[PDB]
Amino acid sequence: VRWTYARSANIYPNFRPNTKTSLLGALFGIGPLVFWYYVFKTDRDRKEKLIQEGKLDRTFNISY
Amino acid sequence: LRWQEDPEPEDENLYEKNPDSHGYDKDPAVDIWNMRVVFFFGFSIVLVLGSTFVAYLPDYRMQEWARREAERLVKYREAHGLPIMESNCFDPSKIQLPE
Amino acid sequence: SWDKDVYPEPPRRTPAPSPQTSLPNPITYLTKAFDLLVDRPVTLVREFIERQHAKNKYYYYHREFRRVPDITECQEKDVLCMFEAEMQWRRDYKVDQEIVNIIQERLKACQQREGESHRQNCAKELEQFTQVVKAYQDRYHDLGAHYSARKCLAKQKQRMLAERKAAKEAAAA
Amino acid sequence: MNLLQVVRDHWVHVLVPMGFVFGYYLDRKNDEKLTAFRNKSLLYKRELKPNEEVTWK
Amino acid sequence: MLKYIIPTIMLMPLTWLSKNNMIWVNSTAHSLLISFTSLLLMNQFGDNSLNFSLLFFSDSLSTPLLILTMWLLPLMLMASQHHLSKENLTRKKLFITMLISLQLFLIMTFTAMELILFYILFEATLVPTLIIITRWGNQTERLNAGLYFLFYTLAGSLPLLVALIYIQNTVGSLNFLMLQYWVQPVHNSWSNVFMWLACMMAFMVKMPLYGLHLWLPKAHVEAPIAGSMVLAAVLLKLGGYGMLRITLILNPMTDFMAYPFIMLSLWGMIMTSSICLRQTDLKSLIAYSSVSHMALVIVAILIQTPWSYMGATALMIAHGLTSSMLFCLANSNYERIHSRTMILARGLQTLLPLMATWWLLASLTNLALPPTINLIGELFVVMSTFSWSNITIILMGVNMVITALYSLYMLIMTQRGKYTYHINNISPSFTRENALMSLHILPLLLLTLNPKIILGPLY
Amino acid sequence: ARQWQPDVEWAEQYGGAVM
Amino acid sequence: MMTGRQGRATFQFLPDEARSLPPPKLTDPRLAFVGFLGYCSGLIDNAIRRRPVLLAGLHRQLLYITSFVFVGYYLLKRQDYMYAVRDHDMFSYIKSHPEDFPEKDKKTYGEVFEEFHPVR
Amino acid sequence: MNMFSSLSLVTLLLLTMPIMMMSFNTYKPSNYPLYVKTAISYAFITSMIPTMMFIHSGQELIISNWHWLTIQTLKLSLSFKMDYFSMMFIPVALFVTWSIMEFSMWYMYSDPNINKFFKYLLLFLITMLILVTANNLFQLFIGWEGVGIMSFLLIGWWYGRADANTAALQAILYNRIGDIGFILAMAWFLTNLNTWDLQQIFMLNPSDSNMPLIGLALAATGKSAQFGLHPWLPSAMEGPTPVSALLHSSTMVVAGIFLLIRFYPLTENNKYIQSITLCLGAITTLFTAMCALTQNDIKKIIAFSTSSQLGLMMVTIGINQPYLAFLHICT
Amino acid sequence: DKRFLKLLRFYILLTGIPVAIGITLINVFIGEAELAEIPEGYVPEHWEYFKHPISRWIARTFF
Ligand SMILES: CCCCCCCCCCCCCCCCCC(=O)OC[C@H](COP(=O)(O)OCCN)OC(=O)CCCCCCCCCCCCCCCCC
Ligand SMILES: CCCCCCCCCCCCCCCCCC(=O)OC[C@H](COP(=O)(O)OCCN)OC(=O)CCCCCCCCCCCCCCCCC
Ligand SMILES: CCCCCCCCCCCCCCCCCC(=O)OC[C@H](COP(=O)(O)OCCN)OC(=O)CCCCCCCCCCCCCCCCC
Ligand SMILES: CCCCCCCCCCCCCCCCCC(=O)OC[C@H](COP(=O)(O)OCCN)OC(=O)CCCCCCCCCCCCCCCCC
Query: DSSP of E78-115, one letter per residue?
Result: HHHTTTTTTS-HHHHHHHHHHHHHHHHHHHHHHHBSBH
d(CA E3, CA E66): 13
**Is it true that the peptide bond before E252 is cis, omega within 30 degrees of 0?**
yes
Count of CB atoms within 10 A of residue E142's CB?
23
Phi, psi torsion values for B21, nearest 5 degrees: -60, 145
Chain breaks in chain I (C to N over 2.5 A) after: none
d(CA H129, CA H147): 10
C-beta of residue H81 within 8 angstroms of C-beta of residue H135? yes
Query: DSSP of A3-32, one letter per residue?
Result: HHHHTTTTTGGG---SHHHHHHHIIIIIHH
C-beta of residue H124 within 8 angstroms of C-beta of residue H247? yes
Q: Do E248 and C83 touch (CB under 8 A)?
A: no
CA angle H45, H46, H47 (to 5 degrees): 90
The beta-carbon neighbor of H62 closest among C104, C112, C122 is: C112
d(CA E408, CA E363): 7
d(CA E350, CA E343): 16
C-beta of residue E115 within 8 angstroms of C-beta of residue E127? no
Question: Chains with 3 or more CB pairs closer than 8 angstroms to I?
Answer: B, C, E, H
C-beta of residue C105 within 8 angstroms of C-beta of residue C111? no
> Of E435, E321, E444, E443, whose CA–CA distance to E81 is shortest?
E435
The residue type found at E235 is L
Report the atom number in ligand 3 closest to the C-alpha of E16: 31
The residue type found at C67 is R
H65 burial type by CB count under 10 A (0-12 exposed, 13-18 middle, 19+ buried): exposed
C-beta of residue E447 within 8 angstroms of C-beta of residue I14? no
Count of CB atoms within 10 A of residue E185's CB?
15
Do the two chains D and H touch, given a threshold of 8 Å on CB pairs and at least 3 pairs?
no
Instruction: Give the containing element (helix H, strand E) for H80.
Output: strand H74-82
Residue nearest to atom 26 of ligand 2 (CA): E256
Length of chain H: 331
Report the atom number in ligand 1 closest to the C-alpha of E158: 1
d(CA H72, CA E46): 12
Q: Do E251 and G117 touch (CB under 8 A)?
A: yes
Contacts of I48 in chain C (CB under 8 A): 59-61
Query: Which residues have a Cβ under 8 Å from the Cβ of G88 and sit 6 or more positions away?
Result: none
Query: DSSP of H246-270, one letter per residue?
Result: HIIIIIGGGHHHHHHHHTHHHHTT-
Query: DSSP of I10-57, one letter per residue?
Result: HHHHHHHHHHHHHHHHHHHHT-PPEEEPPPTT----GGGG-SSHHHHH
d(CA H150, CA H145): 9
Count of CB atoms within 10 A of residue G112's CB?
15
d(CA G112, CA H232): 64
> Of E174, E37, E43, E31, whose CA–CA distance to E114 is shortest?
E174
Q: Give how far the C-alpha of residue A63 lies from the chain's centroid of Cα atoms, to the nearest Å.
A: 27
> In b/e form, how buried is each residue of C28-61, taking b as 16+ CB within 10 angstroms?
eebbeebeeeeeeeeeeeeeeeeeebeeeeeebb
Phi, psi torsion values for C63, nearest 5 degrees: -70, 135
Q: Is A37 a pocket residue for ligand 2 (Cβ < 6 Å)? A: yes
> Of H8, H173, H142, H20, whose CA–CA distance to H83 is shortest?
H8
Collapsing DSSP states into helix, strand and coil, what is residue B44?
A: helix
C-beta of residue B59 within 8 angstroms of C-beta of residue E49? no
Assign 3-class secondary structure to G6-61. Answer: CCCCCCCCCCHHHHHCCCCCCCCHHHHHHHHHHHHHHHHHHHHCCCCCCCCCHHHH
Cα-atom radius of gyration of chain F, to the nearest Å? 11
| Ligand 2 center to E256 CA (angstroms) | 7
Collapsing DSSP states into helix, strand and coil, what is residue C75?
A: strand
> Of E310, E193, E207, E210, whose CA–CA distance to E255 is shortest?
E193
Q: Do E6 and D26 touch (CB under 8 A)?
A: yes
Cβ of F7 under 8 Å from any chain B Cβ? yes
The residue type found at C163 is E
C-beta of residue C71 within 8 angstroms of C-beta of residue C150? yes
The residue type found at E222 is E
Instruction: Give the containing element (helix H, strand E) for G81.
Output: helix G58-96
| Ligand 2 center to A31 CA (angstroms) | 15
Residue G98 region by backbone torsions, left for phi larger than 0, else alpha for psi between -120 and 50, else beta? alpha
Residue nearest to atom 45 of ligand 4 (CA): I19
CA angle E83, E87, E88 (to 5 degrees): 155
In sequence order, what are the beta bridge partners of C60? Answer: I35
Contacts of H211 in chain E (CB under 8 A): 390
> Of E341, C152, G49, E415, whose CA–CA distance to H160 is shortest?
E415
> Of H97, H94, H131, whose CA–CA distance to H11 is shortest?
H94
Angle between helices H114-133 and H2-21 (to 10 degrees): 150
d(CA B12, CA B1): 27
Count of CB atoms within 10 A of residue H122's CB?
23
C-beta of residue E165 within 8 angstroms of C-beta of residue E157? no
Cα-atom radius of gyration of chain E, to the nearest Å? 21
Contacts of B98 in chain G (CB under 8 A): 113
Residue nearest to atom 34 of ligand 2 (CA): E256
The minimum CA-CA distance between H194 and chain C, rounded to whole Å, is 10
Count of CB atoms within 10 A of residue B79's CB?
9
d(CA H175, CA H229): 8
Chain B residues whose C-beta is within 8 A of a chain G C-beta are 90, 94-96, 98
Query: Which residues have a Cβ under 8 Å from the Cβ of G90 and sit 6 or more positions away?
Result: none
> Of G87, G95, G111, whose CA–CA distance to G21 is shortest?
G87
> Of E237, E284, E224, whose CA–CA distance to E98 is shortest?
E224
User: Longest Cα pair distance anywhere in chain F, in angstroms?
Assistant: 35
C-beta of residue H118 within 8 angstroms of C-beta of residue H150? no
Count of CB atoms within 10 A of residue E115's CB?
24
Phi, psi torsion values for I33, nearest 5 degrees: -70, 155
Q: Give how far the C-alpha of residue A20 lies from the chain's centroid of Cα atoms, to the nearest Å.
A: 21
C-beta of residue H71 within 8 angstroms of C-beta of residue H136? no
d(CA H212, CA B78): 36
Phi, psi torsion values for D56, nearest 5 degrees: -155, 160
Report the atom number in ligand 1 closest to the C-alpha of E201: 2
The residue type found at D1 is M
The minimum CA-CA distance between C78 and chain D, rounded to whole Å, is 14
d(CA E338, CA E139): 12
C-beta of residue C132 within 8 angstroms of C-beta of residue C97? no
Contacts of B40 in chain I (CB under 8 A): 11, 14
Q: Do B2 and F1 touch (CB under 8 A)?
A: no
Per-state percent for chain H, helix, strand, coil, to nearest 5: 75, 5, 20
C-beta of residue E65 within 8 angstroms of C-beta of residue E4? no
Contacts of G120 in chain A (CB under 8 A): 48, 51, 64
Task: Please enumerate, as own/partner, the contacts of C123-130 that have beta carbons within 8 Å and a separation of 24 or more.
Answer: C125/H203, C126/H203, C126/H204, C128/B84, C128/C103, C129/C103, C129/C104, C130/A59, C130/A60
Indicate the DSSP class of residue E421.
T
D28 burial type by CB count under 10 A (0-12 exposed, 13-18 middle, 19+ buried): exposed
B18 burial type by CB count under 10 A (0-12 exposed, 13-18 middle, 19+ buried): middle
| Ligand 2 center to E260 CA (angstroms) | 5
> Of B54, D22, B60, I53, whose CA–CA distance to E36 is shortest?
B54
* Ligand nearest to the Cα of E15, by number: 3
d(CA E351, CA E415): 9
d(CA I6, CA E384): 44
Question: How was this model experimentally determined?
Answer: cryo-EM
> In b/e form, how buried is each residue of H199-228, taking b as 16+ CB within 10 angstroms?
bbbbbbebeebeebbbbbbbbbbbbbbbbe
Which of I24, I30, I42 is the best substitution to test chain C (most C C-beta atoms within 10 A)?
I30
> Of C139, C32, C60, C57, whose CA–CA distance to C96 is shortest?
C139
C-beta of residue I27 within 8 angstroms of C-beta of residue E457? no
Query: DSSP of H191-216, one letter per residue?
Result: HHHS--BHHHHHHH--S--HHHHHHH
C-beta of residue E287 within 8 angstroms of C-beta of residue E330? no
CA angle H322, H188, H129 (to 5 degrees): 50
Phi, psi torsion values for E138, nearest 5 degrees: -95, -30
C-beta of residue H314 within 8 angstroms of C-beta of residue H257? yes
Query: DSSP of E375-416, one letter per residue?
Result: HHHHHHHHHHHHHH-TTHHHHHHHHHHHHHHHHHHHHHHHHS
> Of H121, H161, H91, H159, whose CA–CA distance to H247 is shortest?
H121
Question: Chains with 3 or more CB pairs closer than 8 angstroms to B?
Answer: C, E, F, G, I
In sequence order, what are the beta bridge partners of E330? Answer: none
Cβ of E384 under 8 Å from any chain C Cβ? no
CA angle C60, E57, E173 (to 5 degrees): 130
Query: Which residues have a Cβ under 8 Å from the Cβ of G11 and sit 6 or more positions away?
Result: none
CA angle H176, H181, H186 (to 5 degrees): 115
Beta pairing, strands E50-51 & E57-58: antiparallel
d(CA H277, CA H313): 10
Among the residues of E247-281, which ranges form H helices? 254-257, 259-277
d(CA E79, CA E73): 10
Q: Is G62 a pocket residue for ligand 3 (Cβ < 6 Å)? A: yes
The residue type found at E202 is A
**Is it true that the peptide bond before E371 is cis, omega within 30 degrees of 0?**
yes
Cβ of A5 under 8 Å from any chain E Cβ? no
> What number of CA atoms fall less than 13 Å from residue E232's CA on the CB side?
36
Query: Which residues have a Cβ under 8 Å from the Cβ of E76 and sit 6 or more positions away?
Result: E99, E225, E226, E229, E230
> Of E225, E227, E381, whose CA–CA distance to E318 is shortest?
E381
C-beta of residue H264 within 8 angstroms of C-beta of residue H322? yes
> Of E169, E318, E180, E303, whose CA–CA distance to E245 is shortest?
E180
Q: Do G108 and C76 touch (CB under 8 A)?
A: yes
The beta-carbon neighbor of H149 closest among E364, E400, E405 is: E364
Beta pairing, strands C59-61 & I34-36: parallel
Q: Do E446 and B55 touch (CB under 8 A)?
A: no
Residue H184 Cα distances to D37, E244, E354, E444, H218, angstroms: 51, 27, 37, 27, 9
The residue type found at D21 is V
d(CA H48, CA H268): 30
In sequence order, what are the beta bridge partners of E175? Answer: E114
> Of E398, E302, E413, whose CA–CA distance to E347 is shortest?
E413
In sequence order, what are the beta bridge partners of E58? Answer: E50
Collapsing DSSP states into helix, strand and coil, what is residue H317?
A: helix
Do the two chains C and D touch, given a threshold of 8 Å on CB pairs and at least 3 pairs?
yes
Count of CB atoms within 10 A of residue H311's CB?
26
Phi, psi torsion values for C60, nearest 5 degrees: -130, 160
Chain C residues whose C-beta is within 8 A of a chain E C-beta are 77, 79, 82-83, 86-88, 90-91, 94, 144-148
> Of C81, H150, D57, whose CA–CA distance to E364 is shortest?
H150
